[PDB]
Design a binder for this molecule. Structure first.
Ligand code: HEC
Ligand code: HEC
Ligand code: HEC
Ligand code: HEC
Ligand code: HEC
Ligand code: HEC
Ligand code: HEC
Ligand code: HEC
Ligand code: HEC
Ligand code: HEC
Ligand code: HEC
Ligand code: HEC
Ligand code: HEC
Ligand code: HEC
Lengths: 220, 220, 220, 220, 220
């Protein structure tokens, strides 16, 4: 309680690992896109730099930093701040990208619901163009419900090692009938028909559990 | 939430099956035309490649893809997009086919109704030639009513394992009468007659349910 | 919606019965000429082959067909086309018959009305010979009025299980008078007479209903 | 017991080390920010001046001091007073800093709990601005529980050579289901869905011990 | 035994040194605050006057004194009385100081234990003000245990040339755990946590010896 660390270095200086070893163990064995976000995986310092570059990046304003000789006061967060999966992957070369080299991600219409919305510009400029994302509403519902910060509830589902159990629904039957064009009777059949209506009958449920490695096992 | 997947591979990389196992189970037991659309059925990777090739094909523009080293931003859809049954089966050797090897399908007059229509060129060039499809209007009514995307409501009915219940109609009786050519009376009958009019009488209904295997059972 | 049928077989492959069971039930109990047009009646596959051979025959051009390995694009009709009762029964050994074994049917003068006509060659070559068909005009009036395709409105009337109600007409009386050959008077009668004119008087109607089995009941 | 020390010097005069040698040994080997808070580390007098400047600074009022010729009576503490880690690092150039050169530290919302609070002004003026500190509540809980004076229980945890053992918690599984938009059945799937609810299942524990040098070893 | 001393002088007259030479030798080499309490150090008479002024001051009542011509009977002590370190340093200008020029010392809350207490008024009037003395209880425990008169056991420890050996104690480890706010699972981590409890583990000892000159040597 009298020999506090030296923070004279650049970037993150104190060890984030004094209380966060489990996340370190998880991240050291990551084959994902960001193995080299910190410039390496073999050394502990590279992983610490990666954590600094992700959880202390240029999000809103300068974080808290210093080098013994001087210290820059923290503006909106001292140690670290949780950031959305997308705040880095929002704009690339078209606008002012957060990281030079970061690829602008996806392409969806801007999530503007009746209750909540997101400040990030989804359309990336091609507002009339990018609209045919089938999943789409998966992101919208995640944005609507505040479970993870901003839009991570759905974005983390299918890129990460996160097991998920979901309840699928699909009705047993959907069917339809058929009418004639003003003529029918003792003729076997009219020359032409017409079809209208599409009715429904009987309901089915489905549940599936997915493991960490992505294998899909259904408990049908 | 710190060990996201590797997408360095070509084509679809992450497992689509983390949330879609039931469709995998359905498709693995498919004896239909597209058992080998993904190059195989025995391995899971082949089925994943098939799903990529169908739901992420060249429809409008490049989908979202990457390999860790670089990433191509998605243009109109990030993960996958629902596509009509016909968007692949629309043109073959005559025009620019979507798949080299895909057979141009069917042959109908272009669906141009009073309200809606389809951009796909049905006639395949032989506009004056292909017209005598009896079913025809079945496709037109499916196009008119937006239940499935574009023209799948009817196209999926008779090629797939989709049970259907329809209400058939045919009137009980259609009949007609007979006139003479200016001569008749106490002669038994004139040398020649003429027949006109075709009238109707009494109505009949019919309903039929079809199972998955195509067996036709009618509840007459 | 992911396990569509296999069409690798020859001829019709998918089951036509997924939506047409009532016609199957009607045709299975047919004692008519075409019980064995499909090579059998006991098996469902034989009936399906019969439907293919009738509604998908060589009429104008190749229909749509395939076997998984390859697919032949449909030329003028994809699934099936309505065909006239006669298009098969038009020419036999004299010309190019549609079916080897099909018997050329009937024999009438070519229907060439003032408004419409038929491309099928009725006379079968013996143009000066086949002319004394009493019914004849029954076919002509059916051709004139587009109720069934081409010339089926009359052709289906007396060969099929189709109940018909018609209004017969015949005048009550047709009679005539008588003149002498320049001589008459107080002689009782002349040696010879002459007869001219044939007049008419009073009108009668008649209506008859015929059941499926051909029994003739008249509501006189 | 008759030759008491001379305190004629400025600042701290008597040796604090007559009973506090272990803390001296600990502080002499400090590579942290405050090696030169006393103007040196090599001489004992510099370390004594550092202890005076830290534990006898201008906190509330003048401490006890004298020079033989005169003595200033102690106001609220004679020898030394324990001071919070932050009482020096609370305000810099904006307000009246305690040390000219001391950097204002961190940036958090003012800790105003339902039970206790702190008089130090955390927001530093930018009340609406500094709010996105992820750790935040770590400081609040330390303030709530009186284990160290004011807000040192958490502030000393990650800057100092203080080994810590904590029990991490994270539940085994969190998952969710899925509903259709009024349409489903024998259609394979509806054009669009909706997703609601996020459920939980099974619990996991985690414990980690951290050494003096900051190495993170987890006993998973 | 017939030529007893002359005490006609003022103050102390007989030589205190006839039996107390060692204390004289100790005090002659004193660089502390009271070199000139007797008005000098060079002459023996000045040191004798200092001893008189300290051990024969106005404490409770007049001591024993005389000048041959007259003698004042001793009231509570004839030769000298042991006095507490503080009885002179208790009140200055606020109350009735013992010496005009004596500085009121320190500032602590009044020592009022469950068993013993002191009549001297510690708070000096600022009862609500002077409370933040960290050492504080060091004086209280000295007052509780009668080893030196009143409150000298601790007061003599850190101002005088008195070597001390003390046994320090501090436990090896004190640590804590962490809980979530109603949400956790397959989400990597919840948006926010909570921390409770502070546990202990393993014990450490420490002993230190301090010499006359104040150098701190620890036998760790
Ligand atoms: C008492 C509550 C605290 C005070 C006073 C300060 N901190 Fe911290 N701190 C933390 C990190 C991760 C850094 C990196 C900064 C760098 O690399 O220079 C810092 C830095 C500082 C600094 C210098 C930089 C600046 O002034 O902005 C000061 C003066 C400072 N800290 C004061 C992390 C943490 C932390 C982890 C949860 C806690 C509890 C504290 N800091 C507490 C205090
Ligand atoms: C937060 C909402 C998300 C961000 C940011 C990104 N995604 Fe995805 N994603 C998905 C698939 C099926 C792929 C295949 C691409 C490939 O094979 O390379 C991807 C890929 C990416 C990429 C790299 C490729 C590119 O930039 O176009 C990035 C940068 C990316 N994704 C960012 C699928 C999904 C998905 C399933 C429903 C979700 C929720 C997300 N992606 C979310 C995000
Ligand atoms: C979406 C509107 C459709 C597409 C695309 C295709 N069909 Fe069909 N189909 C039907 C039958 C009775 C057959 C028999 C052909 C055979 O036995 O091989 C077929 C066949 C095909 C084929 C392969 C043969 C070919 O290309 O000509 C393709 C590529 C094909 N179909 C594409 C019947 C029906 C049907 C019943 C009313 C409908 C709605 C569709 N087909 C729809 C589509
Ligand atoms: C008997 C209980 C005590 C009396 C009477 C005094 N002290 Fe102390 N003391 C201590 C320190 C660290 C200082 C520094 C002051 C300086 O540098 O001038 C002092 C100083 C004094 C002074 C002069 C200054 C003043 O009057 O404020 C006086 C008159 C004085 N002290 C009287 C520390 C300690 C200590 C360490 C735990 C103890 C037990 C005492 N002092 C006890 C007494
Ligand atoms: C022990 C003193 C820690 C050190 C060293 C670091 N962190 Fe931490 N962190 C700690 C706790 C007890 C918690 C949970 C408490 C809470 O109120 O949530 C956290 C949490 C985080 C988070 C997420 C915050 C949240 O989800 O609520 C992040 C992003 C985080 N910590 C980052 C982080 C970094 C980058 C560190 C190195 C500078 C670091 N932490 C060190 C305790 C401790
Ligand atoms: C007044 C007696 C202080 C107390 C109590 C604490 N700090 Fe300090 N700090 C003070 C000054 C005047 C300065 C700037 C001059 C200097 O020599 O640094 C600082 C600076 C720091 C820094 C900056 C270096 C860096 O962050 O890398 C840090 C980290 C720092 N102080 C930490 C710190 C901690 C953890 C404290 C409580 C145990 C603490 N300081 C108390 C003055 C004072
Ligand atoms: C869980 C994180 C999923 C993963 C992994 C994949 N998909 Fe998905 N998909 C998911 C949901 C919850 C839904 C329905 C939600 C909705 O708004 O509709 C879907 C739906 C589809 C669809 C059809 C869209 C529709 O009919 O509305 C398609 C074509 C689809 N998904 C494709 C697809 C592919 C190719 C995947 C591998 C890259 C894949 N999905 C993964 C959830 C999840
Ligand atoms: C800023 C700190 C980022 C955050 C937050 C996320 N990503 Fe990232 N990403 C970033 C950069 C600078 C790059 C390009 C450089 C590189 O080393 O890749 C990327 C790249 C990706 C990729 C590309 C590889 C691939 O797609 O196969 C993917 C898939 C990716 N990022 C995913 C991803 C996810 C799921 C994130 C939220 C958990 C995420 N990134 C956050 C910068 C940043
Ligand atoms: C349900 C998906 C069907 C399947 C399987 C088959 N047919 Fe069909 N047919 C269907 C409907 C809804 C209609 C009437 C709609 C209309 O627009 O007329 C028909 C009609 C026919 C006809 C006559 C057309 C007419 O008179 O207008 C024929 C000759 C016909 N169908 C043939 C046929 C064959 C051979 C099939 C097996 C390949 C077959 N149909 C399957 C619906 C469905
Ligand atoms: C592009 C992703 C396609 C989609 C969408 C559909 N089909 Fe397909 N089809 C495609 C190719 C490249 C081929 C030829 C190569 C092969 O392996 O077959 C086909 C072929 C068929 C066939 C031929 C076999 C047969 O008819 O017996 C059929 C019947 C067929 N396809 C049917 C079909 C249906 C019903 C579709 C919508 C659900 C459909 N295809 C979509 C490429 C693509
Ligand atoms: C081609 C698909 C045909 C259609 C359309 C019709 N007929 Fe047919 N018919 C065809 C063949 C190849 C044969 C000879 C082989 C055989 O199994 O009969 C026939 C035969 C007849 C007969 C002969 C038996 C008899 O007259 O007693 C009759 C009566 C007959 N066909 C009637 C008929 C009718 C009424 C049709 C329209 C509803 C019709 N045929 C169509 C081939 C084809
Ligand atoms: C022996 C006579 C000591 C001298 C010389 C100094 N200190 Fe001390 N200190 C001593 C003891 C026996 C204790 C613990 C007793 C208690 O009641 O706590 C302390 C404690 C402190 C503390 C912390 C108080 C606490 O945490 O309770 C501080 C800040 C402190 N001491 C400072 C200090 C300084 C600056 C000194 C030089 C003037 C000094 N001490 C000398 C015993 C002795
Ligand atoms: C009355 C006989 C006293 C006794 C008993 C003690 N002190 Fe004293 N002290 C007294 C006076 C009149 C003065 C001021 C005049 C002077 O010459 O100093 C003092 C002063 C001090 C000082 C001030 C110098 C400094 O603190 O640096 C100190 C430190 C001091 N006194 C200490 C001290 C101690 C430790 C005593 C008990 C052993 C003690 N004094 C007793 C009068 C009297
Ligand atoms: C020999 C005849 C002495 C003369 C001359 C002085 N003192 Fe003394 N003193 C003497 C003895 C044998 C003792 C200890 C005996 C005992 O019962 O304690 C003392 C003790 C003191 C003390 C402290 C008393 C104690 O701690 O118990 C004091 C304060 C003291 N003496 C003062 C003192 C003064 C001021 C003298 C000059 C007038 C003086 N003493 C002379 C023996 C002798």
């Amino acid at each position: 309680q009298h020999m506090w660390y030296n923070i004279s270095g650049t970037g993150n200086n104190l060890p984030c690992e004094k209380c966060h070893a489990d996340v370190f163990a998880e991240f050291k064995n990551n084959p994902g896109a960001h193995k080299t976000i910190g410039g390496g995986t073999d050394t502990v310092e590279h992983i610490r730099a990666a954590c600094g570059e992700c959880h202390r990046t240029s999000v809103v304003g300068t974080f808290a930093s210093g080098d013994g000789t001087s210290a820059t006061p923290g503006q909106e967060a001292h140690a670290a701040a949780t950031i959305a999966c997308m705040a880095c992957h929002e704009f690339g070369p078209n606008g002012n990208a957060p990281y030079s080299g970061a690829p602008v991600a996806g392409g969806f219409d801007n999530v503007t619901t009746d209750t909540a919305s997101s400040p990030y510009n989804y359309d990336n400029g091609d507002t009339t163009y990018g609209t045919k994302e089938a999943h789409q509403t998966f992101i919208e519902r995640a944005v609507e419900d505040k479970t993870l910060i901003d839009s991570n509830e759905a974005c983390i589902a299918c890129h990460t090692y996160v097991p998920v159990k979901i309840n699928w629904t699909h009705k047993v039957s959907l069917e339809f009938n058929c009418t004639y064009e003003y003529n029918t009777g003792t003729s076997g059949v009219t020359t032409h028909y017409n079809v209208t209506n599409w009715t429904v009958n009987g309901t089915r449920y489905t549940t599936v559990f997915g493991n960490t490695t992505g294998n899909g096992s259904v408990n049908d």
